[PDB]
RNA sequence: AGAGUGUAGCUUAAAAGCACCCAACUUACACUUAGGAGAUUCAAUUGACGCUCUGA
């Protein structure tokens, strides 16, 4: 975070795009299982698949 | 902590120019007063 | 309902108070609406000082009923020696304070004396005036 | 439980000259002045200078500088007071007019037969007397000067007890207004001290904590 | 008859065609933003220092009051008693040069 | 020398919520729109570097 803040220097925020592929990869390689379990619970998979 | 409220700004929109004026009263002391026109000295009798 | 155990659950008037002497008991003491007139020649300086005073009062949990400003006095002084005009003006702003208890007033006075701006005097007194 | 009755007072002094502006503060003030000059709406001097010059040029093709020079010469003739009145003296540690930007504090030196403590302007109050009255008497007698000490309230500021027979040093605050000292070259080695010199001189722990409630500024 | 002086005079209506241009550059805006951030940080630090000093003063006064009440149960009321010496409270701020 | 301790101001959270202010709408305060500083003090359930109290 410190390196990113030093490289941006404030001037970039005064409108960056931020890629999405790396963000999706990181989300799938970390908290992906959490969102997957949440979606499964919302869709009603545990209450029907494994009872 | 005297320089805290010293730095100010005109919060209004319509206002004439204001220059730093050193007003000297009978007591003898310069005070940064914002008087009309760029007056450098205004001795108060 | 009344008989039901959920009585008085939607009561909100008892929480809102939708309705000055100087109490001086033995242990508790409270002044009577102290008025702090900020006499100065600059308008921005006086405004900033009043804003800082109000911010300090709000941070210290001090009540601020009124905070009006007094009119300007156009003091026309003729610089004699040669006639040279100099229409000066003296601005004044009042800040009412009531919440004070023992050393709180001393703390506030010390804070004021420590944070004084250039070209601004003081003159604290009671509220009994005629605007 | 014989508690030794002792008092004291932490003298102060209101500043006169303003404090210096930090380079960052100076840049902020310059930016504020620039934005104010940019947001201002016309001016009497500008209206009387620019329009007059334009009219004169138009008439020639068919005030301002004088007043500026007058103001410059008036400012040059008028000599202001010396703001830095500390470096010129340096060794004048016992002078009320030494420091003007920071707060000053009295400092008296007293030596006893049994101890030699760096005694701050202390006092001694009587059971039948009041602490405020004792402090006023000590300020009007020990200092030997006609001062207009403007107090704030009857409450204290800091207490420090010491046992061996208990005791208690009661301190207070007093703001001066016009201190007329008589005979400054007296035997009483009184010294005026602010903050850094206070922390550098005070050797004991009883007074080392007195600076915790003093306006650091 | 409270009549404040906050209404813009009528002279500031017609006279308003002398400085209508307000052009700046990217470097100037960046420098202004940096200066504003630095001043905000400095003001926050100063406010924190002032709050710490106020807390220290309050703690010292509380300790003094406690010591007074412990070693003098007949002077706490006199100490808390506010004296009538604050009605003509008048004091001038610090100037720039001495007399 | 002993006791209390150990996430910035606070937490029956384990790197989040309430605190803060600089600019615009304010006489002023508040709300709202724009940003930041912010911390498990280190070494392997334990040892020491920062404060309060009890003493000399």
Swiss-Prot record, chain A:
Compartments, as annotated in UniProt: Mitochondrion
Assembly description? Component of the mitochondrial large ribosomal subunit (mt-LSU). Mature mammalian 55S mitochondrial ribosomes consist of a small (28S) and a large (39S) subunit. The 28S small subunit contains a 12S ribosomal RNA (12S mt-rRNA) and 30 different proteins. The 39S large subunit contains a 16S rRNA (16S mt-rRNA), a copy of mitochondrial valine transfer RNA (mt-tRNA(Val)), which plays an integral structural role, and 52 different proteins. mL38 is located at the central protuberance.
- Return the similarity comment: Belongs to the phosphatidylethanolamine-binding protein family. Mitochondrion-specific ribosomal protein mL38 subfamily.
What is the name of the protein in this document? Answer: Large ribosomal subunit protein mL38
- This chain is encoded by the gene named MRPL38
Swiss-Prot record, chain B:
Q: Where in the cell is it found?
A: Mitochondrion
Quaternary structure, from the entry? Component of the mitochondrial large ribosomal subunit (mt-LSU). Mature mammalian 55S mitochondrial ribosomes consist of a small (28S) and a large (39S) subunit. The 28S small subunit contains a 12S ribosomal RNA (12S mt-rRNA) and 30 different proteins. The 39S large subunit contains a 16S rRNA (16S mt-rRNA), a copy of mitochondrial valine transfer RNA (mt-tRNA(Val)), which plays an integral structural role, and 52 different proteins.
Family named by the database record? Belongs to the mitochondrion-specific ribosomal protein mL55 family.
Q: What is this protein called?
A: Large ribosomal subunit protein mL55
The primary gene name is MRPL55
Q: Which residues of the full protein are shown?
A: 34 to 78 of 128
UniProtKB/Swiss-Prot annotation, chain D:
Q: Which GO terms describe its biological process?
A: mitochondrial translation
Q: Does the keyword Ribonucleoprotein apply?
A: yes
Task: Give residue numbers for the modification (N6-acetyllysine).
Answer: 168
Q: Name one GO molecular function term.
A: structural constituent of ribosome
Gene Ontology CC: cell junction; cytosol; mitochondrial inner membrane; mitochondrial large ribosomal subunit; mitochondrion; nucleoplasm
Could you list this entry's UniProt keywords, alphabetically sorted. Answer: Acetylation, Mitochondrion, Ribonucleoprotein, Ribosomal protein, Transit peptide
The UniProt similarity line reads: Belongs to the mitochondrion-specific ribosomal protein mL46 family.
- What is its quaternary makeup? Component of the mitochondrial large ribosomal subunit (mt-LSU). Mature mammalian 55S mitochondrial ribosomes consist of a small (28S) and a large (39S) subunit. The 28S small subunit contains a 12S ribosomal RNA (12S mt-rRNA) and 30 different proteins. The 39S large subunit contains a 16S rRNA (16S mt-rRNA), a copy of mitochondrial valine transfer RNA (mt-tRNA(Val)), which plays an integral structural role, and 52 different proteins. mL46 is located at the central protuberance.
> This chain belongs to which protein, by name?
Large ribosomal subunit protein mL46
Organism of this sequence = Homo sapiens (Human)
Question: Which gene is the coding source of this polypeptide chain?
Answer: MRPL46
From Swiss-Prot, chain E:
Location in or out of the cell: Mitochondrion
Q: Which domain of life is it from?
A: Eukaryota
Task: Please give the tissue specificity annotation from the record for this chain.
Answer: Ubiquitous.
The family line of this record is: Belongs to the mitochondrion-specific ribosomal protein mL40 family.
Give the quaternary structure.
Answer: Component of the mitochondrial large ribosomal subunit (mt-LSU). Mature mammalian 55S mitochondrial ribosomes consist of a small (28S) and a large (39S) subunit. The 28S small subunit contains a 12S ribosomal RNA (12S mt-rRNA) and 30 different proteins. The 39S large subunit contains a 16S rRNA (16S mt-rRNA), a copy of mitochondrial valine transfer RNA (mt-tRNA(Val)), which plays an integral structural role, and 52 different proteins. mL40 binds to the major groove of the anticodon stem of mt-tRNA(Val) in the central protuberance.
* Designated name of the protein: Large ribosomal subunit protein mL40
Span within the parent record = 83 to 181 of 206
